[PDB]
Amino acid sequence: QLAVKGGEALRTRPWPAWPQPAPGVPDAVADVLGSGRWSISGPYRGTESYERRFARAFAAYNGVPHCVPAASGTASLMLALEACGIGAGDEVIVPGLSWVASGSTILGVNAVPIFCDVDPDTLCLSPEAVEAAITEHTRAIVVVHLYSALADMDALSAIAERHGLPLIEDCAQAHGATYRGVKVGALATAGTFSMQHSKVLTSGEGGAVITRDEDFARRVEHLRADGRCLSAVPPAPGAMELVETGELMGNNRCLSEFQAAILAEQLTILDEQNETRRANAAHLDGLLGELGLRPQTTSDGTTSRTYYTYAVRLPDGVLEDVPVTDVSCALTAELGFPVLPSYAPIPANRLYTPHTRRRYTLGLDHERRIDPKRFALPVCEDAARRTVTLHHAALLGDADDMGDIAAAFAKVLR
Amino acid sequence: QLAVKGGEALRTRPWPAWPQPAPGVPDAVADVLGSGRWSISGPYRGTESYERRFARAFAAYNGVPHCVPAASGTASLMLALEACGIGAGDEVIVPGLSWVASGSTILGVNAVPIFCDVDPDTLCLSPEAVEAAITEHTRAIVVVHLYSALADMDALSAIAERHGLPLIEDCAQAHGATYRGVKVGALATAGTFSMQHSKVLTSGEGGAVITRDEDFARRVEHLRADGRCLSAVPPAPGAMELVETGELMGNNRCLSEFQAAILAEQLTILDEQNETRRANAAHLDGLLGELGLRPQTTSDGTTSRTYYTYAVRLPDGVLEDVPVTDVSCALTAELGFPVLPSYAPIPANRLYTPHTRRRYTLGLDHERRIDPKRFALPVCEDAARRTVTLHHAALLGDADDMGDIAAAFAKVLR
Numbered sequence: 001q002l003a004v005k006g007g008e009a010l011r012t013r014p015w016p017a018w019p020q021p022a023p024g025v026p027d028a029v030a031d032v033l034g035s036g037r038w039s040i041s042g043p044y045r046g047t048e049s050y051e052r053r054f055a056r057a058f059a060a061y062n063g064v065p066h067c068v069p070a071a072s073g074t075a076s077l078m079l080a081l082e083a084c085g086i087g088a089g090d091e092v093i094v095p096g097l098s099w100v101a102s103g104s105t106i107l108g109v110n111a112v113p114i115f116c117d118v119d120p121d122t123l124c125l126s127p128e129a130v131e132a133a134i135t136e137h138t139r140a141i142v143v144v145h146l147y148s149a150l151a152d153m154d155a156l157s158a159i160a161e162r163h164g165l166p167l168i169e170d171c172a173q174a175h176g177a178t179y180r181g182v183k184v185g186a187l188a189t190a191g192t193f194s195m196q197h198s199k200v201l202t203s204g205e206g207g208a209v210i211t212r213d214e215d216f217a218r219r220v221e222h223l224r225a226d227g228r229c230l231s232a233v234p235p236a237p238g239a240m241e242l243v244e245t246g247e248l249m250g251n252n253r254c255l256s257e258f259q260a261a262i263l264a265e266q267l268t269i270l271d272e273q274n275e276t277r278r279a280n281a282a283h284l285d286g287l288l289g290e291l292g293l294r295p296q297t298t299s300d301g302t303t304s305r306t307y308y309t310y311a312v313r314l315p316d317g318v319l320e321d322v323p324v325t326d327v328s329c330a331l332t333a334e335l336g337f338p339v340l341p342s343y344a345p346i347p348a349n350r351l352y353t354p355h356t357r358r359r360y361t362l363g364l365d366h367e368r369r370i371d372p373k374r375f376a377l378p379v380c381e382d383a384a385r386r387t388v389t390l391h392h393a394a395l396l397g398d399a400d401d402m403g404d405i406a407a408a409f410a411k412v413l414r
Numbered sequence: 415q416l417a418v419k420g421g422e423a424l425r426t427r428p429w430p431a432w433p434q435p436a437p438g439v440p441d442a443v444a445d446v447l448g449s450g451r452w453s454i455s456g457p458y459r460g461t462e463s464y465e466r467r468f469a470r471a472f473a474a475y476n477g478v479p480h481c482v483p484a485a486s487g488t489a490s491l492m493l494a495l496e497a498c499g500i501g502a503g504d505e506v507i508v509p510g511l512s513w514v515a516s517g518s519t520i521l522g523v524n525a526v527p528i529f530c531d532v533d534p535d536t537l538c539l540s541p542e543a544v545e546a547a548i549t550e551h552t553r554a555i556v557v558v559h560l561y562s563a564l565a566d567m568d569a570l571s572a573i574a575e576r577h578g579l580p581l582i583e584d585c586a587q588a589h590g591a592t593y594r595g596v597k598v599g600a601l602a603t604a605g606t607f608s609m610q611h612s613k614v615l616t617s618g619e620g621g622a623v624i625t626r627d628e629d630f631a632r633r634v635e636h637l638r639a640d641g642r643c644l645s646a647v648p649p650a651p652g653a654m655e656l657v658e659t660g661e662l663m664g665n666n667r668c669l670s671e672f673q674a675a676i677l678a679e680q681l682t683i684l685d686e687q688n689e690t691r692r693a694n695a696a697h698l699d700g701l702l703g704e705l706g707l708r709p710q711t712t713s714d715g716t717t718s719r720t721y722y723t724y725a726v727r728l729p730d731g732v733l734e735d736v737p738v739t740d741v742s743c744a745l746t747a748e749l750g751f752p753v754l755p756s757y758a759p760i761p762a763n764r765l766y767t768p769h770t771r772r773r774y775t776l777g778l779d780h781e782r783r784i785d786p787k788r789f790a791l792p793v794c795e796d797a798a799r800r801t802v803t804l805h806h807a808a809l810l811g812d813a814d815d816m817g818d819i820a821a822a823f824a825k826v827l828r
């Protein structure tokens with residue numbers, strides 16, 4: 001009966017393509033091609049760079065005054081980290097359940113990630129877990145709005161404010177979502193974004209840092225352009241717009257003109273796309289609830305959700321002896337679309353191997369601190385055993401598609 | 415009479431635009447747009463990624479079996495360093511005279527850069543300096559083919575081999591140059607490239623690592639894709655092509671498909687554009703020689719030069735107490751094209767401030783070793799005080815263009 005064991009698939013036809021190119025992209029790219037400036041680090045040519053146009057637009061969209069575009073969400077994390085003053089030996093609190101980059105970025109600026117457990121329904125950083133993990137070395141909190149949920153920002157902001165800690169929102173999986181009507185990434189110290197391929201807003205690769213703090217964005221600017229930042233006023237044509245101010249050392253984490261032009265165009269269809277997903281997901285939550293599955297929920301205070309990924313936990317007492325990879329494999333086969341397990345908890349992820357990397361060999365104390373064996377994360381581990389996920393391309397079709405998703409799940413439950 | 419001092423400029427006509435888009439780009443990009451895969455970290459869709467196409471193109475272009483593309487010349491360096499096993503506290507020998515990233519990339523893997531003086535005429539890393547600077551802590555040598563010159567690679571390889579030290583060629587400023595017939599970056603352990611805007615091969619932002627060691631490439635691969643590597647053979651369509659091997663922890667420094675596609679197109683005309691620059695530079699060498707200027711020279715054995723930038727030392731006993739910035743500012747106003755001082759030596763570069771980044775505060779002994787105040791680089795200092803430069807866009811025009819350059823020099827020199 002099951003396709004994985006040679007049965008008939010329920011469905012094999014294609015799902016929606018991703019990404020969906022916005023209509024203005026080829027013109028915007030053509031204009032870049034002819035501009036005589038393909039990165040911000042090239043000389044001023046008399047008009048505004050697409051790096052700036054995008055920054056302006058993305059800032060406006062998130063309802064903040066500052067944005068610094070960047071090469072990747074990995075870069076965005078690291079820039080935001082270092083702009084908070086985070087450095088060698090500082091503890092950064094992070095959720096245990098996220099893509100591996102959530103741990104490796106902290107490592108990459110020589111800080112010590114302090115993996116904290118997550119809420120069992122939303123899978124976002126547990127505030128109770130955060131308070132318990134604060135030490136005298138703690139210097140930042142990173143919160144991920146994971147898959148389709150927002151974290152409990154009222155509680156987290158409360159803990160950050162009390163302790164005098166910056167709170168960074170990693171919105172790689174949440175673009176355009178809103179908590180109490182404020183766009184996610186505009187609620188705390190700084191917001192951080194991926195525009196990698198799979199993300200709801202994408203240029204194949206990219207990122208951004210957003211903030212309400214001018215000095216913060218200025219530090220970020222230095223950190224992404226080798227200690228340079230854009231002049232207040234444009235210079236004459238042929239002169240560098242990035243000035244060697246040298247307030248703070250940096251590296252190059254710049255976003256190309258091509259990618260900036262692409263994101264500006266993709267941004268104009270973002271909300272429409274998120275509406276399509278949102279509606280389909282509302283439909284699915286119902287169908288899957290009827291089967292005893294528990295979809296991921298969102299924190300109280302959330303006013304709109306962005307579905308980067310649909311995550312749903314299997315019903316208690318069903319397939320409890322079958323490894324999730326098998327379950328997810330059988331679903332994949334019925335559906336014609338990947339259905340994958342939840343991320344492993346980071347300290348148990350085979351991709352997280354800091355002792356293999358000589359960059360991090362900083363002597364015994366630091367090696368003890370960053371040893372991932374120190375972290376047990378009951379909720380993350382359970383979620384990893386029990387929760388499967390679908391990428392959001394699956395939410396971009398018809399209401400009928402949701403029926404297929406439910407049919408596959410029902411089939412596999414027997 | 416000087417334009418800068420109120421007078422009439424010599425030239426106001428515009429100079430060649432840069433970058434020059436290759437004719438296949440729009441179609442290439444449109445192909446990306448509709449492909450359903452905008453990065454390598456997106457699932458496989460039944461055809462080769464542009465990342466693979468460019469990679470294979472650039473490997474073959476350089477005479478070597480392996481190429482791993484990357485997000486920038488900065489990433490490329492850091493990838494190469496970690497793939498040599500460089501980590502915390504290791505010393506890496508580097509030239510004193512180069513863009514600041516040559517220093518900060520080393521710092522970023524927690525290593526201790528050891529700036530060494532250069533050859534007074536080629537401005538490239540001096541063999542004697544390198545030999546003098548070796549210690550039991552040295553774990554690599556990085557050499558830069560600076561501006562338009564190639565280093566003495568036979569001399570450098572010989573020192574590398576004697577000491578059992580890997581030798582990385584930073585070829586950011588030398589795409590397609592050849593030493594004794596062999597493509598630059600194919601001469602030692604690994605070659606790193608920047609495709610930033612201003613470089614001769616560009617996608618606004620981009621880079622590559624090339625090597626003939628398959629294991630080394632595999633390590634680079636892991637290091638750029640968060641501990642993942644492309645499968646030996648493609649998976650089924652819809653499956654991830656990057657596989658979580660667990661062999662080696664990494665970070666995201668992937669290059670987007672859009673950039674990959676652009677670089678594959680721009681590769682097809684690189685040789686022709688290099689020929690143009692070459693002929694203009696030859697002719698300009700003579701003209702500037704007749705004024706007592708000394709053009710940058712290249713190492714014996716160079717079989718062809720890539721001009722990323724035309725560098726030239728001012729004549730001895732002439733303007734010999736006017737700041738270089740002042741001379742370079744005067745030439746610019748005469749030429750309607752930017753002419754700039756050489757790089758400062760990195761330890762004296764205001765962009766180079768380790769003390770400003772708490773990331774590096776690893777302890778007293780480390781902090782002292784990475785203090786740039788420890789260094790003395792007399793040749794770098796002298797060249798920086800007397801050398802001015804023109805980006806290679808100047809070299810893309812006529813012989814009349816070369817005469818304008820000479821005629822600006824002539825005029826400034828009184």
Ligand SMILES: Cc1ncc(COP(=O)(O)O)c(CN[C@@H]2C[C@H](N)[C@@H](O)[C@H](O)[C@H]2O)c1O
Nearest residue numbers: 072073074099101144172194195196455666
């Ligand atoms: C919460 C969060 N924080 C930072 C990042 C890092 O963003 P990037 O450097 O753009 O990859 C991501 C990206 N995460 C994705 C996750 C995906 N499973 C993987 O295949 C992909 O390469 C990566 O872009 C994330 O989800």
Ligand SMILES: Cc1ncc(COP(=O)(O)O)c(CN[C@@H]2C[C@H](N)[C@@H](O)[C@H](O)[C@H]2O)c1O
Nearest residue numbers: 041252486487488513515584586608609610
């Ligand atoms: C020898 C060498 N090694 C590594 C790099 C680093 O490459 P990227 O990360 O691509 O900038 C460069 C680039 N250097 C350039 C130099 C230029 N003056 C500056 O305005 C520009 O932003 C930068 O890309 C280099 O020349």
